């Protein structure tokens, strides 16, 4: 297909924990970004077939998106907050790798990244 299988949202072996920080990442951080007017291109895996982007998965080998992150949080997939933060960060840098710098999709990502940094600056102490 052009589309790879989507990133997993569960795993038989990967260990997990629940923490107040992971709860905050779902209830506050993911929620705040998800409701933003510019969230919609980031709420699901890039569908290269639908969007006609034959080069996307030639370039992006570690895809990530907030739909996957939301499911990972809901499924208790993460061991700690750092693992979840890493997924957000991958989502943003993938956008900057793939896209032309002046593209509106990059402007959208940048607005969401600025909000994300504000929210992570208030990550509660564990
Ligand atoms: C559902 N959906 C629509 C677009 C995407 C999308 C998501 N991600 C993460 C991306 O990194 C995308 C890259 N594209 C192609 C750009 C070329 C012209 N731009 C034009 C453009 C600008 C602003 C918004 C949409 C399209 C879009 N499209 C995407 N997902």
UniProtKB/Swiss-Prot annotation:
This is Bromodomain-containing protein 4. The chain holds residues 44 to 167 of 1362 of the full protein. Belongs to the BET family. JQ1, a thieno-triazolo-1,4-diazepine derivative, and I-BET, a benzodiazepine derivative, have been tested on tumors with success. Treatment with GSK1210151A (I-BET151, a I-BET derivative) has strong effets on mixed lineage leukemia and promotes myeloid differentiation and leukemia stem-cell depletion. It is linked to Cornelia de Lange syndrome 6: A form of Cornelia de Lange syndrome, a clinically heterogeneous developmental disorder associated with malformations affecting multiple systems. It is characterized by facial dysmorphisms, abnormal hands and feet, growth delay, cognitive retardation, hirsutism, gastroesophageal dysfunction and cardiac, ophthalmologic and genitourinary anomalies. CDLS6 inheritance is autosomal dominant. A chromosomal aberration involving BRD4 is found in a rare, aggressive, and lethal carcinoma arising in midline organs of young people. Translocation t(15;19)(q14;p13) with NUTM1 which produces a BRD4-NUTM1 fusion protein. Phosphorylation by CK2 disrupt the intramolecular binding between the bromo domain 2 and the NPS region and promotes binding between the NPS and the BID regions, leading to activate the protein and promote binding to acetylated histones. In absence of phosphorylation, BRD4 does not localize to p53/TP53 target gene promoters, phosphorylation promoting recruitment to p53/TP53 target promoters. Changing residue 104 to G: Found in a patient with a neurodevelopmental syndrome; uncertain significance. Interacts with p53/TP53; the interaction is direct. Interacts (via CTD region) with CDK9 and CCNT1, acting as an associated component of P-TEFb complex. Interacts with RELA (when acetylated at 'Lys-310'). Interacts (via NET domain) with NSD3, CHD4, BICRA and ATAD5. The interaction with BICRA bridges BRD4 to the GBAF complex. Interacts (via NET domain) with JMJD6 (via JmjC and N-terminal domains); the interaction is stronger in presence of ssRNA and recruits JMJD6 on distal enhancers. Interacts with NSD3. Interacts with NIPBL. (Microbial infection) Interacts with bovine papillomavirus type 1 regulatory protein E2. This interactions may serve for the tethering of viral genomes to host mitotic chromosomes allowing successful partitioning of the viral genome during cell division. Chromatin reader protein that recognizes and binds acetylated histones and plays a key role in transmission of epigenetic memory across cell divisions and transcription regulation. Remains associated with acetylated chromatin throughout the entire cell cycle and provides epigenetic memory for postmitotic G1 gene transcription by preserving acetylated chromatin status and maintaining high-order chromatin structure. During interphase, plays a key role in regulating the transcription of signal-inducible genes by associating with the P-TEFb complex and recruiting it to promoters. It is found in: Nucleus; Chromosome. Ubiquitously expressed.
